[PDB]
Design a protein around this motif. Structure first.
Motif: not given
Lengths: 72, 71
Positions: B1-5, B32-36, B47-55, B59-62
């Motif tokens: 579970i990683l957070t990237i702003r 399947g990411a926690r997007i705020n 835009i905060t993104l929380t989840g695994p490297t995958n999610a 999200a990013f790619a999307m």
DNA sequence: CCCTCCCT
């Protein structure tokens, strides 16, 4: 609450959307109309004007005035 | 579970939420990411993104693809 | 001259 469609050449439209989008941003915020400009580099573009009479009027008149100062 | 702003202009961010709200709906569900997203007409939005490297990666790619097309 | 798009 009435709607009226205006036809517009490519160049014509660019004027209503002055560099950066402000021209509309006025017409919108200043007439009270719902103004929409169908995108995509199409030779003919619709600008739809939507709202009550005076709102339309105002939006119309500013549109007219904008093109008026573009001859040519 | 990683957070990237992600720092994002007011225009950009409106495209991520594109229309009624469905553009984020798409990404929230299909990545399947926690997007705020920070709220209000501030020029500058996070835009905060929380989840695994995958999610995170999904999200990013999307996002990029919603951005890429505007243009 | 390209504009806004309001989500947990």
């Amino acid at each position: 609450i009435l709607t009226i469609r205006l036809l517009m050449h490519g160049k014509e439209v660019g004027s209503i959307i002055g560099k950066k989008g402000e021209s509309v941003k006025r017409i919108r915020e200043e007439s009270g109309a719902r103004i929409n400009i169908s995108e995509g580099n199409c030779p003919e573009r619709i600008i739809t004007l939507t709202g009550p009479t005076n709102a339309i009027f105002k939006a119309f008149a500013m549109i007219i005035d904008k093109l008026e100062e573009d001859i040519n």
